[PDB]
Amino acid sequence: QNITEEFYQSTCSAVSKGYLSALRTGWYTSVITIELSNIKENKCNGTDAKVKLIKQELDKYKNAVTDLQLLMQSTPATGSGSGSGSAIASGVAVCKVLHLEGEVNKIKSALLSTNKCVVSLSNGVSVLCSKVLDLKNYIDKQLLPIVNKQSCSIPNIETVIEFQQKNNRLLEITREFSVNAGVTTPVSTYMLTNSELLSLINDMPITNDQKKLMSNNVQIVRQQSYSIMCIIKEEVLAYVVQLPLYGVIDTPCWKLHTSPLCTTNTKEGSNICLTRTDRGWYCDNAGSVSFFPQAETCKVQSNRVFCDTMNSLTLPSEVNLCNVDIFNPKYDCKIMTSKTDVSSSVITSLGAIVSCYGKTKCTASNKNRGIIKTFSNGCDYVSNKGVDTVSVGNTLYYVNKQEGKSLYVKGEPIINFYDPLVFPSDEFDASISQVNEKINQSLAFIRKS
Amino acid sequence: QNITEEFYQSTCSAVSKGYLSALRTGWYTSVITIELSNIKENKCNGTDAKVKLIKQELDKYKNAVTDLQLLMQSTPATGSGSGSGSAIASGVAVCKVLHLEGEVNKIKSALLSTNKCVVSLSNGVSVLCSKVLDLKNYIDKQLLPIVNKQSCSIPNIETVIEFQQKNNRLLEITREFSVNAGVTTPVSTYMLTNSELLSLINDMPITNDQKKLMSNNVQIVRQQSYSIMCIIKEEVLAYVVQLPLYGVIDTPCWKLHTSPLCTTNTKEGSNICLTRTDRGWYCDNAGSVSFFPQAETCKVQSNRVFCDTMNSLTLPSEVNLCNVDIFNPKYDCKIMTSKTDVSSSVITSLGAIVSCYGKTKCTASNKNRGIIKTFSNGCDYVSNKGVDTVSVGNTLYYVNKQEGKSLYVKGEPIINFYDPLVFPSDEFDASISQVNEKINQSLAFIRKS
Amino acid sequence: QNITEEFYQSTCSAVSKGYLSALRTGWYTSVITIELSNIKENKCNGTDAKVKLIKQELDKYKNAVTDLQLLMQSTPATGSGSGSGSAIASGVAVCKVLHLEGEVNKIKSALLSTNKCVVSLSNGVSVLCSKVLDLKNYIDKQLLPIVNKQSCSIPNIETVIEFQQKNNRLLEITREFSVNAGVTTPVSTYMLTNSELLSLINDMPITNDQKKLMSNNVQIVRQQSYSIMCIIKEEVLAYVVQLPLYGVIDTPCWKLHTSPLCTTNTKEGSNICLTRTDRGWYCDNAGSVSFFPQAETCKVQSNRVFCDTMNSLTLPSEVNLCNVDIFNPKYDCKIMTSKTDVSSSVITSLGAIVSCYGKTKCTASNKNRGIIKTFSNGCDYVSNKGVDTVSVGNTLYYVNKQEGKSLYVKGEPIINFYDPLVFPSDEFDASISQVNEKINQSLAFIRKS
Ligand SMILES: *[C@@H]1O[C@H](CO)[C@@H](O)[C@H](O)[C@H]1NC(C)=O
Ligand SMILES: *[C@@H]1O[C@H](CO)[C@@H](O)[C@H](O)[C@H]1NC(C)=O
Ligand SMILES: *[C@@H]1O[C@H](CO)[C@@H](O)[C@H](O)[C@H]1NC(C)=O
Secondary structure (H helix, E strand, C coil): CCCEEEEECCCCEEEEEEEEEEEEEEEEEEEEEEECCCCCCCCCECCCHHHHHHHHHHHHHHHHHHHHHHHHCCCCCCCCCCCCCCCCHHHHHHHHHHCCCCHHHHHHHHCCCCCEEEEECCCCCEEEEEEEEEHHHHHHHHHHHHHCCCECCCCCHHHHHHHHHHHHHHHHHHHHHHHCCCEECCCCCCCCCHHHHHHHHHCCCCCHHHHHHHHHCHHHHHHCCEEEEEEEECCEEEEEEEEEEEEEECCCEEEEEECCCCCCCCCCCCCCEEEECCCEEEEEECCEEEEECCCCCEEEECCEEEEEHHHCEEECHHHHHHHHCCCCCCCCCEEEEECCCCCEEEECCCEEEEEECCCCCEEEEECCCEEEEECCCEEEEEECCCCCEEEECCEEEECCCCCCEEEEECCCCHHHHCCCCCCCCCCCCEEHHHHHHHHHHHHHHHHCC | CCCEEEEECCCCEEEEEEEEEEEEEEEEEEEEEEECCCCCCCCCECCCHHHHHHHHHHHHHHHHHHHHHHHHCCCCCCCCCCCCCCCCHHHHHHHHHHCCCCHHHHHHHHCCCCCEEEEECCCCCEEEEEEEEEHHHHHHHHHHHHHCCCECCCCCHHHHHHHHHHHHHHHHHHHHHHHCCCEECCCCCCCCCHHHHHHHHHCCCCCHHHHHHHHHCHHHHHHCCEEEEEEEECCEEEEEEEEEEEEEECCCEEEEEECCCCCCCCCCCCCCEEEECCCEEEEEECCEEEEECCCCCEEEECCEEEEEHHHCEEECHHHHHHHHCCCCCCCCCEEEEECCCCCEEEECCCEEEEEECCCCCEEEEECCCEEEEECCCEEEEEECCCCCEEEECCEEEECCCCCCEEEEECCCCHHHHCCCCCCCCCCCCEEHHHHHHHHHHHHHHHHCC | CCCEEEEECCCCEEEEEEEEEEEEEEEEEEEEEEECCCCCCCCCECCCHHHHHHHHHHHHHHHHHHHHHHHHCCCCCCCCCCCCCCCCHHHHHHHHHHCCCCHHHHHHHHCCCCCEEEEECCCCCEEEEEEEEEHHHHHHHHHHHHHCCCECCCCCHHHHHHHHHHHHHHHHHHHHHHHCCCEECCCCCCCCCHHHHHHHHHCCCCCHHHHHHHHHCHHHHHHCCEEEEEEEECCEEEEEEEEEEEEEECCCEEEEEECCCCCCCCCCCCCCEEEECCCEEEEEECCEEEEECCCCCEEEECCEEEEEHHHCEEECHHHHHHHHCCCCCCCCCEEEEECCCCCEEEECCCEEEEEECCCCCEEEEECCCEEEEECCCEEEEEECCCCCEEEECCEEEECCCCCCEEEEECCCCHHHHCCCCCCCCCCCCEEHHHHHHHHHHHHHHHHCC
16 A cells, blocks of 8 residues: 655665565466357349348358368467466367367357356366357347348348347457467457456456456456467357466565666776666565566556566565665675666656766756756665656656655665776676675785786 | 768678657647547337347447446556656646546536637646547437437437447447557557547647658657547546657767677687677767667658657767777777677668678679679678678578668778787677776786786 | 477487478568549538438548558658568568559559459569459449439438448558558458458469468468558559568478576585577578577477578578587587576476476476476476476466477586586676686686786
């Protein structure tokens, strides 16, 4: 609920605390079926425009079914497979079951009397079935008596329009499945209406607090979901929707922000830099910390973070000590070094870190008062309380207007504890104790000779 | 207007000059409203197909409004926030104002008599208002007399069709806003027709030369714009369109192309490489140079470059001296080094740089004459005048057919001025003077022992 | 057909063999035309709803043509240009020909009598022409007699509906071309129906085995295609479709998987790591090996790999010896080193490599038996035969269920042949023989002093 920040002048890094967690750890597969009509082309003596329009829309239904047929002749399993495996792997497991004999018949039988069921497949997976569109009922009852005879009966213009409305959702689903090789993400309203999604959430074998969680963030749920095309078989079109399951909930999370920490010598060519690494989202997870390096693997909405553990890292709970004591031996606090003194800025949750070097004009202004702070050479921070923009050189960043308390922790910049001459000025991903050992090694290389 | 190129044999790099500039430095927010109809469901005795079709399309209007309602219950502010801040930050500032009382009433009053207005909000922002669709007028005048009574009146088939045409734009806007969590980019023709966009450009408080600039490049303007969902309130649907403002215009720009510069010893394992860094777009901006490292942050159309300063860098105007004298002390000309002699090629604006090493078959051919040039070991360049393709190994690159003059600047490759034994063969982002100091340091490590 | 795997305990890497190849080496351009109607607005005394609906849909046709007109006033050539050149370069060559006089007349004449032709342009390119929609015929025959007179004739509701159906494909094509600046990929069903694509494949001057190849993988073909907007001219709308040409077919391919290989000392701060580089897809191509570093540049479907040679590398056929003998001098087998002992896992084609270090809980379980293997410190591998998931820390990966034989090649991990004290613990992209020379250099730096 209450968001806070802490800027560490000593390491040129800030930590935004107070966020609650929702980590994806599992998948809920669910089958979405469309009852289709097995009709073959029935060309009849037809002339007046109502039969032509009906026959045209019927051909769009036929090409949509044959397009779905060449789509299932190839199950590419193209979703993920990026060394972290497939994400859709779980949903693919349901499609291989649907290809079994009698398996399309079980969901077709469970949905013989009701629209929404639960079906126990022949592999132990209890999936929830949904039937979102019924074209077999409409084509076999309202359309076949028009095209079945020798000469076509004249359908009313109302039938032509009602048939374009029902057939539309099928046509759009085949269009998405065609351009994406059967696997789509996010799940569009054609794949699942907000109304159908909320009905699937209410029926899940999950706690009521988790149903309130997923229902208040349906947009986040859509963006973290997959729609996988299954099978066209026995007057039934089936495709699987994989919805995220959040195994870690309401757990502490914080966000690390890092910026270069250089020396401010006036001699060009004589400055050395240092930047804490592993910036990003950290969350408590099962006695450890789940770290998320990729920026888009975590969507944040309203004080909670929605992450996917597929692309994360597991760190000891001691990783937090780099935020309070970077010189602490329980944890190997890693940095990267260079001699590149370029000014830059990072917009944090409650303020902005500014690393200003050289002649760069770094400043922070308010919309109505103008410039309220001019930064000197070095690394600094400013709160958003009273600040609107931060400009560094020719670049203007907008400060985030989130409410929260910020705390400035004064301290000596650690780049000053290093002798410039005996410094590793090209180490990437080096630990503090690792760098102290390389400094002990270059000073041993100068003492002996 | 006139595009030229310069290849530097000494550093294996080329510069494409002559481009004019258009840098995004600001945002213009504008409110786009849709007048809605506050109706509640009115189930009536209905049987004949025209009432059923009308009631179906009316339900799609109702679900679209409730879907927009759960979308504004969560303002995620998910656009950007990538350490450069939010891009949509400015547009979000307008949405927080719309949630104020009386604020939906001001734009609703300014648009009470005209379609397009200007409205001064209660926070000092003078936004331009547009009213693109009027469903309150259509539902309350043409539809309510059909559904208001006890039994429904029979609407003509013309009313059913005209209502599907007007309601369509609302349905597509909710579909885009649902899959993208309220923030879309680019701005589609459903969000804003080319006709409405041109009318917004003509009304902006900008110079006439800037209106000619944005109007001749509307496609670039759409791709650099954002559509942010605001509020559903008081029979008004409002969402903000953020259009780019180009503060830097008709300013000099050039593009740096770099390729590995290795030695051509015949001994495998004995070659060292060097590659100028910071390749990309450079533009004069306010006495400095704005450098763009990311490739997609700059779209080039017809001799002008359209960049976003949010992801750029500010460099001293002296950065140009790496293109004429890399050994010049006013600027720290940075390179990266390695021992990886792999052949490769870079398609420039007017030609192609080819770095050929080992047994790789590097060649450049014309469509009707065949191979017109065979490259030897080392780094070379060829103009597009008479050249169609360049093949390196099993890879074929197409040479850009842009008209312009190319200039070949002969010179000794600088990788030959370095003794291989005493070379830093793993430096990344190192300056020329930095490398000379490391060579002075490894030669001091061999002289003393 | 038969997929196999080989895990090398000595280098912590695995190779998935048995895949067949389809590399894109060329482009087939083809022109897709829409015959348009040159009509100007003809406002007439109109009141009853059928004329209003017709005039509304006619205005959507007019704005679509003018939107296409400002789209061709700017040919941005924004597709690619990423230093590998443009991909669309070949297709752009056809658009510059269409702007020639008489050139729209040749395809318009070849398609005067048939729907599908071949046309020899005035630049030697024999392109295949397709005419997918005929609006000039429909507007000039069925619509002009209604709007041509002084007062409008009353069209039937059937005409209003048939005109919305034909005009729809034009409107969707302008919507895609507007948001993407004239260059779209993949090619949607609006740009080309699966039926039109299959008819273009059958007519190509390619072998019958290649037509069977592209027809069985149309989804892969769409995802690797481009649609480029050409010209609006002389009652003809033309745009070019670039389809991939696979010059390398049924050639051997394998996939390299790599994972960190560290020492298992119990002392924190004392471990050194090593990881083979250049992981990805390798395919035999013209006596060499085409290597693909980017992960998305190769789509794999059903034992064959579909790669684009534009973003690839050419390696000596000897690159395979890093998979059997990394210490072999014919090839410089490159690695990268560090001191970062973080546990991680890689899902291979037939199993999973697990690098477990520190206190991380690495394990592999079966769905019904539970944990079937607990990994110790070091690098290991497990087959998918009997294994369902692999968990490392708080991350759970799904093992790929592809059928195939796996082979575990036991051997001493090479990180143990290196003395930790005299190790380059920050080399990136270093060769084995390069590292042995740096170890010979740091041992010479300690022997002399
Ligand atoms: C090297 O490490 C030893 C062990 O702590 C210490 O006594 C010595 O002062 C260090 N020398 C340096 C950091 O130059
Ligand atoms: C090292 O730098 C000094 C100062 O310019 C110079 O005199 C000397 O020749 C250099 N030695 C090298 C580059 O080996
Ligand atoms: C250095 O290389 C030489 C040449 O093969 C070899 O004899 C010597 O043992 C090496 N020394 C090392 C690897 O420490």
